[PDB]
Assembly symmetry: C6
Homo-oligomer: 153 residues x 6
């Protein structure tokens, strides 16, 4: 459980992200696919992208990034009371996309790296500590649902 | 032990399956053999089938699917009081067919995937949770019999 | 410890076996050597047999099967009070033949398969459960003697 | 927790190091890169250096050594009350440089070897014991931050 | 600890062995070297022997067998009170010959096999049980000394 | 902790060693390097020695053996109260020579073998037991210092 103080550090940096959700989505994507190329194989819609240039130019990948960050933002804004938001996401990612927990760890790593680069003034050690805690909370509850749905993860 | 509420979610989606048992049987089969080809080797009657086309055309495989789902349906409708129904099934599958528990897990996975595809309105996160729980109950009791009969599983 | 009820299920099917001990001995043998060929290597008297045809024709192998089943029958009829019968068998099999417990498991598996094939009316799930329990009792006590005699098994 | 006596042994030898921070920085560097060449790969600014001669001649590597030892000195002088000093160092080394704990162990080993060579009169068994304890304290608290920041280390 | 009854079974069969110590020594030797050829490598005095024929003909190997069995007999006759007899044997075998416990297990196995072959009337299941227990007692106390002397065994 | 009786057995045989420290040093050396050639690699001053003949002829290796045994003798004569003597030895062997505990075990083995060969009348089972205990005490306390100094060993 996160403290109100920790939630504030998270929502304060997220308000900066919201100033340009599409741009933030792109940076996270490229970071993820360059650091862990195997994840790209899960996207039959984007697996043909070869270079960073191609990724940056994909209008579809950009739109998907916005969809992703918007869903995550709705979750964070619930400050732990995200049961309703997690159910449909756990179902699709476990049953249709088949995304293991290890990959959620990788994208969490990408989110932190991008926030650290673009928002150093609002992403100091304590702020990163809180964001990490929030994402670990997310993964802990998703992995829980995964088990209930019958997917090891 | 499942709650009455959980059983209801299971029987509600199963009533949809019963509207076309043969068609549901076929989809589960193809899904199983494509996802885990090694299972096909256990069926000396169907191991010669090479493609999805051939499987879809096999009148015998279709009939067997109905026999399978009918037996499973009788079990689910007992809501946990399935001792009598499990004995003969555990004996044949342990002693004659020699089907390991790992393969029952694979077919459970196939059942969930097919229900999720054909009945999204009646197979939400909670419904899938209940169905998974019912199938895990099935496997837990079968594995138990397996041990009693002298088969590791 | 087996219940009187369990012993009855065992002795009831064994009375059928006794109607043709020699034939039952042969079926068990062929089943064992085909399923686990390595066991044949322990019999310097039968290791030259190449096919199922040759095995079925061996008058010596047939006679040995009768000797084996007769010894086992005497044990089962003691309903757990088989200490005297086990000593000489554990000594020869541990010290002279050098038969590991793993091989006693294999022949137990062969006995069950043959009874299941030839006597389905008297070898239902409960009956098989009892027979398995009786054979596991046998192996448990033999393995115990093995240790006392200085053979790991 | 270190005793006041142990801290004194540490600060007494460190006062000698401060008489020539740049020279001490160089010796530690060369010792580290020769003993564990893989660490050099983390420095994109120095990874091109091939020999000890080149390292000794690099004006940039010399300047960096001073920056490093100065930061470490500030930490040691806090005698355990180094929370504020550790936060920014853990953030950069975990998130940007990605330096595993194993590498902090290697540089700790290099520091001890150099002090042992240049200051034997002030680096006896007890003194080395205290310095080791101080560096293990450093690593223990850094590894702790690493976890909070989301880096395994 | 062995019972007086168990000791009697051991000494009763040993009195038969004493009727021909040299012959018993030879049988044990050949059995050991044929079953576990690696043990022969420890005897620089006998490692040149190639066949069973050569072993049976070696006058020196025969004499050594008598020396061995005589020492073992003196131990068994002490019925557990063999501390004085074990010290010099543990010292030479641990420090000079370097004989691991695994090899004492192998020769124990050879002793049992030979007694079983030559004295079936006095080496039934109970008798073998007692002899095994006596030899395990021997090995347990020797391994203990080994540790005290500084040899792992 | 060793008893006064055990210390006496150790010091009694050591008084014999002192009658020819140089000769004893040489025998231990050759035994060590022949049994465990890898240890020679630690001595940059002696690693060029190829044969036993060369070792026996090295005046420097002979002198070093005396230095070694003299230091060990001073330790043993302290009968457990060797804290002051161990500190400088642990520092050099951990930090400069980098000698793992495994190698101290090897030289302990060499010491015992040589005493057993040259002094059988004063190195019986009990005497060897005491000497082993004294050397294990030595290694236990050295390994302890190693940890304090920051060397795993
Ligand atoms: C921060 C974590 C994540 C969030 C909040 C998230 C969110 C979403 C959302 C809202 C959708 C659209 C609706 C749906 O299908 O449920 C989606 C689709 C998808 N997600 Fe995720 N996702 C996350 C991580 C991942 C990761 C790490 C992978 C793969 C390595 C993944 C693979 C997919 C795929 C394959 C789709 C379908 C895309 C398409 O074909 O249109 N997701 N995700
Ligand atoms: C949902 C789980 C399952 C149910 C309810 C089920 C049910 C049945 C039923 C009722 C029969 C006919 C009667 C009998 O032989 O007992 C049967 C036959 C058989 N089952 Fe299953 N089964 C299940 C899973 C499997 C799996 C996963 C395998 C193999 C990977 C398997 C292999 C067989 C075989 C080989 C036969 C014989 C088919 C033939 O040759 O005619 N079963 N099963
Ligand atoms: C149900 C378990 C078994 C029973 C009741 C049994 C019984 C017997 C009996 C009564 C004999 C003759 C007397 C004797 O030597 O003790 C015998 C001989 C023998 N048994 Fe078994 N046995 C069993 C399992 C096995 C197994 C699994 C193996 C090998 C894989 C084995 C290998 C032998 C051998 C090699 C002989 C000697 C045959 C010859 O050369 O004449 N037995 N057994
Ligand atoms: C005694 C432990 C260490 C201390 C006190 C220390 C201190 C520092 C300081 C103060 C900086 C500059 C500011 C910053 O980036 O945070 C720095 C930069 C850096 N450190 Fe460390 N560091 C330590 C160990 C290491 C080790 C062992 C590695 C790698 C094996 C490492 C890799 C780096 C890198 C790559 C930089 C950036 C250099 C550049 O490109 O300019 N550090 N470190
Ligand atoms: C029942 C167990 C054993 C007993 C009672 C025993 C007894 C003896 C005795 C009394 C001696 C002569 C005096 C001495 O050196 O201590 C001896 C010598 C020896 N033993 Fe054993 N021993 C046993 C097992 C073994 C085993 C299993 C090995 C090797 C695999 C072994 C290897 C040797 C060697 C190499 C010698 C020296 C022979 C020579 O070169 O003359 N012993 N043993
Ligand atoms: C009974 C255990 C040992 C004792 C009492 C001992 C004692 C000594 C002493 C007193 C010195 C000289 C002063 C010093 O450098 O501390 C020394 C030097 C040294 N020792 Fe040991 N030592 C022991 C075991 C070993 C072992 C097993 C190794 C290596 C396998 C080793 C490697 C060295 C080396 C390399 C030197 C330096 C020699 C030179 O280059 O002059 N020592 N030792």
């Amino acid at each position: 459980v996160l403290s109100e103080g920790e939630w504030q550090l998270v929502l304060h940096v997220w308000a900066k992200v919201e100033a340009d959700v599409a741009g933030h989505g792109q940076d996270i994507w490229i970071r993820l696919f360059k650091s862990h190329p195997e994840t790209l194989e899960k996207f039959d819609r984007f697996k043909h992208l070869k270079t960073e240039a191609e990724m940056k130019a994909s209008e579809d990948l950009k739109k998907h990034g916005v969809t992703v960050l918007t869903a995550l933002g709705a979750i964070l804004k619930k400050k732990g009371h995200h049961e309703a938001e997690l159910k449909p996401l756990a179902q699709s990612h476990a049953t249709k996309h088949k995304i293991p927990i290890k990959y959620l760890e990788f994208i969490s790593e990408a989110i932190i790296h991008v926030l650290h680069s673009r928002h150093p003034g609002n992403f100091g050690a304590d702020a990163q500590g809180a964001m990490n805690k929030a994402l670990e909370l997310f993964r802990k509850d998703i992995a829980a649902k995964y088990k209930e749905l019958g997917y090891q993860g």
